[PDB]
Amino acid sequence: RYNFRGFRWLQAMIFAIEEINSSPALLPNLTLGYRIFDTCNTVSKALEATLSFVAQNKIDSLNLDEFCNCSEHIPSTIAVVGATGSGVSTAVANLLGLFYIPQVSYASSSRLLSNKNQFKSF
Amino acid sequence: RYNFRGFRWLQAMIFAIEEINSSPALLPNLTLGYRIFDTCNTVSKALEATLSFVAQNKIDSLNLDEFCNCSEHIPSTIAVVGATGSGVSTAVANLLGLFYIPQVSYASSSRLLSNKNQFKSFLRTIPNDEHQATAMADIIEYFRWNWVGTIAADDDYGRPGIEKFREEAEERDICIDFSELISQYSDEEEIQHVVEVIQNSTAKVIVVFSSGPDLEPLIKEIVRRNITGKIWLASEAWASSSLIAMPQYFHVVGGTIGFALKAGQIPGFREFLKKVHPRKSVHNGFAKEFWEETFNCHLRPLCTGDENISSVETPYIDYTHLRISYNVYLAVYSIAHALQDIYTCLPGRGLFTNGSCADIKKVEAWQVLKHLRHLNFTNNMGEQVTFDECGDLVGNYSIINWHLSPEDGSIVFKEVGYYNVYAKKGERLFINEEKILWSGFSREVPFSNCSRDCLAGTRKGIIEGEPTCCFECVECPDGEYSDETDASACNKCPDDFWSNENHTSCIAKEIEFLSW
Amino acid sequence: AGTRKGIIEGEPTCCFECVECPDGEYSDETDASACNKCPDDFWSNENHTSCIAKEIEFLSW
Ligand SMILES: *[C@@H]1O[C@H](CO)[C@@H](O[C@@H]2O[C@H](CO)[C@@H](O)[C@H](O)[C@H]2NC(C)=O)[C@H](O)[C@H]1NC(C)=O
Ligand SMILES: *[C@@H]1O[C@H](CO)[C@@H](O[C@@H]2O[C@H](CO)[C@@H](O)[C@H](O)[C@H]2NC(C)=O)[C@H](O)[C@H]1NC(C)=O
Ligand SMILES: O=C(O)[C@@H]1Cc2c([nH]c3ccccc23)CN1
Ligand SMILES: O=C(O)[C@@H]1Cc2c([nH]c3ccccc23)CN1
Ligand SMILES: *[C@@H]1O[C@H](CO)[C@@H](O)[C@H](O)[C@H]1NC(C)=O
Ligand SMILES: *[C@@H]1O[C@H](CO)[C@@H](O)[C@H](O)[C@H]1NC(C)=O
Ligand SMILES: *[C@@H]1O[C@H](CO)[C@@H](O)[C@H](O)[C@H]1NC(C)=O
Ligand SMILES: *[C@@H]1O[C@H](CO)[C@@H](O)[C@H](O)[C@H]1NC(C)=O
Ligand SMILES: *[C@@H]1O[C@H](CO)[C@@H](O)[C@H](O)[C@H]1NC(C)=O
Ligand SMILES: [Ca+2]
Ligand SMILES: [Ca+2]
Numbered sequence: 166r167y168n169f170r171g172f173r174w175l176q177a178m179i180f181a182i183e184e185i186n187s188s189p190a191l192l193p194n195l196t197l198g199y200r201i202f203d204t205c206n207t208v209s210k211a212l213e214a215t216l217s218f219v220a221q222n223k224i225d226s227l228n229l230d231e232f233c234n235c236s237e238h239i240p241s242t243i244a245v246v247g248a249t250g251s252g253v254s255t256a257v258a259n260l261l262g263l264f265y266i267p268q269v270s271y272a273s274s275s276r277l278l279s280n281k282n283q284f285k286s287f
Numbered sequence: 288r289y290n291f292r293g294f295r296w297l298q299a300m301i302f303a304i305e306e307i308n309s310s311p312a313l314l315p316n317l318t319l320g321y322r323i324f325d326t327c328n329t330v331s332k333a334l335e336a337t338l339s340f341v342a343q344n345k346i347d348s349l350n351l352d353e354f355c356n357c358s359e360h361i362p363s364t365i366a367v368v369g370a371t372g373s374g375v376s377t378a379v380a381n382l383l384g385l386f387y388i389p390q391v392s393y394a395s396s397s398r399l400l401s402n403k404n405q406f407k408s409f410l411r412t413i414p415n416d417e418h419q420a421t422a423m424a425d426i427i428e429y430f431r432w433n434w435v436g437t438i439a440a441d442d443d444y445g446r447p448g449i450e451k452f453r454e455e456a457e458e459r460d461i462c463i464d465f466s467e468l469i470s471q472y473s474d475e476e477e478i479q480h481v482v483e484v485i486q487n488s489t490a491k492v493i494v495v496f497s498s499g500p501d502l503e504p505l506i507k508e509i510v511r512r513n514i515t516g517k518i519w520l521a522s523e524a525w526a527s528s529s530l531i532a533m534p535q536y537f538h539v540v541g542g543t544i545g546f547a548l549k550a551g552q553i554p555g556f557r558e559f560l561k562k563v564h565p566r567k568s569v570h571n572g573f574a575k576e577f578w579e580e581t582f583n584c585h586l587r588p589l590c591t592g593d594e595n596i597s598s599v600e601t602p603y604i605d606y607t608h609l610r611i612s613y614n615v616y617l618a619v620y621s622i623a624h625a626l627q628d629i630y631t632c633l634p635g636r637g638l639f640t641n642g643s644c645a646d647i648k649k650v651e652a653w654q655v656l657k658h659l660r661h662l663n664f665t666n667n668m669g670e671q672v673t674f675d676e677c678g679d680l681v682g683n684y685s686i687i688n689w690h691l692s693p694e695d696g697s698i699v700f701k702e703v704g705y706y707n708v709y710a711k712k713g714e715r716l717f718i719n720e721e722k723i724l725w726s727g728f729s730r731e732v733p734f735s736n737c738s739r740d741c742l743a744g745t746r747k748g749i750i751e752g753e754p755t756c757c758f759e760c761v762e763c764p765d766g767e768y769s770d771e772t773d774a775s776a777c778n779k780c781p782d783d784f785w786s787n788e789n790h791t792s793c794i795a796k797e798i799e800f801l802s803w
Numbered sequence: 804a805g806t807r808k809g810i811i812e813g814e815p816t817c818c819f820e821c822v823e824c825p826d827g828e829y830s831d832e833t834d835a836s837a838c839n840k841c842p843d844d845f846w847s848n849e850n851h852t853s854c855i856a857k858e859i860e861f862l863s864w
């Protein structure tokens with residue numbers, strides 16, 4: 166199915182980023198980019214997107230006794246905006262707080278995400 | 288903290304793999320390898336291990352337009368055995384089912400992992416926890432209690448079980464006074480509040496869906512304040528925990544009634560356990576710390592290397608039954624039997640398109656998942672093992688009691704009954720009350736009703752703001768009679784009859800006239 | 804008023820019946836869980852809503 170409200174939210178994020186870039190007072194001489202994916206209200210899609218986000222930290226993983234390298238020009242995401250559902254946000258929060266990447270949600274409101282022992286960067 | 292039971296489970300997995308390798312009948316000319324990590328009962332470590340597992344499936348990931356590179360030395364994990372916690376299992380299962388890697392757990396029992404619209408590749412050798420909550424309700428109903436309390440862990444294991452117990456209890460006219468949530472990281476204020484809630488109640492029986500590491504702070508605080516005279520109904524997670532079944536806690540947690548899984552037989556397992564050595568174990572890197580903690584040495588005095596394992600009493604060998612270890616054994620054998628069923632595929636009977644078969648030399652994870660979904664094999668003891676449409680394996684329960692040891696002074700786990708999950712509803716619970724020692728020493732069943740039952744000649748009356756179980760009885764009025772105990776209202780006598788002085792029955796009226 | 808609440812078995816406390824108070828007791832207000840045995844020298848109405856002083860009987864001039 167197609168969600169027009171979700172596309173409006175995506176447009177809101179893009180609009181905010183562009184307005185930050187145009188303004189000369191907030192972060193002079195610095196530009197903000199973005200990499201925005203669709204979750205389809207499903208954990209699997211959001212987890213694929215999160216793996217894309219943390220590929221660099223996968224390169225920086227410690228468990229692997231043998232090194233692995235990816236494309237150098239792959240950007241390292243500083244912070245993530247999302248997501249809507251609480252289960253999606255829980256899974257994404259696990260993966261992101263594995264690497265201490267801030268994640269600011271806009272519609273997840275479950276109390277289980279108020280635990281800073283499990284969700285450090287949420 | 289070091290867990291010797293977990294190291295025993297790891298050794299059980301290694302033993303099963305080696306036994307399968309030695310066996311010529313199972314997987315001829317094929318050798319099984321392994322890669323085993325430590326979760327530390329934490330989601331983060333398990334997720335790092337899972338990332339290491341899927342490092343090779345992540346090569347052909349669509350989310351990245353660019354191409355990632357991984358060394359060929361990194362192997363491809365075909366299946367995973369783990370894990371213990373239900374939250375840990377959920378976190379691992381997300382990533383594993385992202386790539387259709389089968390995952391067979393041995394201790395996770397949350398019902399939330401039965402949903403296959405989220406957890407595509409998940410299997411269990413331990414039964415689901417609906418039956419355990421129903422069995423706790425059956426026990427409470429059997430011993431004729433109606434006024435109980437509930438404690439649960441704030442995770443994926445405690446909450447669904449406590450909810451199932453709540454609904455099953457309200458179906459059976461059982462009233463729950465309090466319900467609290469505890470965690471391993473609960474502040475002093477939270478523990479104090481829960482302890483105060485326990486004190487303020489008058490309900491002796493308390494039902495706990497939790498684990499040892501999560502129940503430890505509450506038990507410690509209760510022992511610190513000496514809150515005795517409580518009846519504890521344990522779930523399988525902490526009914527046999529070494530962190531709660533410690534003798535100096537006995538006066539608080541004596542006479543506890545709990546659940547246990549049906550044990551199993553692994554011939555030759557103890558001999559494999561006793562052969563551990565830090566130097567001989569090159570594949571097993573967890574032997575060094577195990578040895579250091581066993582003999583309190585550092586290889587603090589050094590380790591001579593000539594110590595005997597049996598000299599130190601640890602859960603590594605100081606055990607009686609093998610229940611979770613049998614689950615690990617069954618998990619490994621189930622994966623091996625799926626691989627064998629792949630290896631013996633007839634050309635026109637495959638599970639795949641047009642009856643095609645897989646190639647065991649280039650077998651893939653999803654094919655093994657398909658074969659696990661249709662698995663049917665016979666155990667060493669001689670039982671059939673299949674998984675349902677949700678990947679569950681149903682089994683019996685043994686109801687145990689916490690007694691004291693006359694010789695050692697430790698805590699014994701006597702068997703006082705069984706719960707047969709295969710029987711019809713209402714004929715599943717069996718208990719020998721002649722062996723239960725309430726509070727560890729007593730021989731009379733404790734009383735755990737809100738209010739006392741009221742005898743003939745009275746009727747119940749509502750106490751405002753309190754549940755149905757709590758009531759105050761008022762004597763029957765003149766003319767009405769009450770011939771039952773715990774009656775909602777006084778029955779009225781027929782014509783030409785009037786109530787006794789007791790109102791238990793009613794006599795016939797007298798007739799007065801001037802007589803001869 | 805005049806009737807007290809009664810327990811229905813197998814139902815929560817929110818669900819109740821109600822029955823008239825016995826002769827000698829009354830129920831002035833609603834949501835009453837009991838009927839008051841009101842003091843000496845007093846009996847109940849025919850509707851058990853309040854109390855009436857008992858009639859004193861003796862030979863009168
Ligand atoms: C669960 O427990 C019940 C009762 O303990 C088992 O039923 C018994 O099975 C044995 C044979 O294994 C019979 O000799 C008994 O007569 C049975 N008792 C009954 C029916 O009350 C049942 O087999 C167990 N389930 C298992 C082992 O999967
Ligand atoms: C506590 O309350 C329970 C109510 O659930 C009482 O159980 C009843 O016991 C009588 C005994 O004759 C049975 O006839 C009823 O059927 C039971 N009610 C049930 C099972 O719902 C129990 O007896 C009470 N405790 C005491 C000590 O009387
Ligand atoms: O946490 C959650 O699941 C909900 C999801 C949600 C909320 N508000 C919404 C509006 C539109 C679509 C979805 C939502 C509140 N937080
Ligand atoms: O789902 C869970 O978390 C529990 C954990 C658990 C169970 N049984 C155990 C025995 C020992 C240690 C841990 C456990 C039951 N499933
Ligand atoms: C316990 O009861 C006392 C006495 O009424 C009260 O002061 C206290 O707040 C109660 N505590 C809890 C946790 O209910
Ligand atoms: C705790 O209570 C038990 C039983 O009442 C008693 O035997 C024991 O001495 C108590 N210990 C303390 C420290 O109060
Ligand atoms: C599993 O195999 C046994 C034969 O040992 C058979 O009796 C049983 O019906 C089979 N179960 C299923 C579900 O195929
Ligand atoms: C009424 O109760 C008294 C007190 O126990 C008893 O002695 C008497 O027999 C009872 N009357 C009956 C049961 O008719
Ligand atoms: C008693 O109450 C009834 C209401 O059911 C009323 O109709 C009647 O007049 C009352 N009788 C009195 C107050 O004497
Ligand atoms: Ca700017
Ligand atoms: Ca979403």
Ligand SMILES: [Ca+2]
Nearest residue numbers: 326370371372
């Ligand atoms: Ca674990």
Ligand SMILES: [Ca+2]
Nearest residue numbers: 499528529530
């Ligand atoms: Ca334990």
Ligand SMILES: [Ca+2]
Nearest residue numbers: 751752753754
């Ligand atoms: Ca109340």
Ligand SMILES: [Ca+2]
Nearest residue numbers: 457813814815
């Ligand atoms: Ca009911």
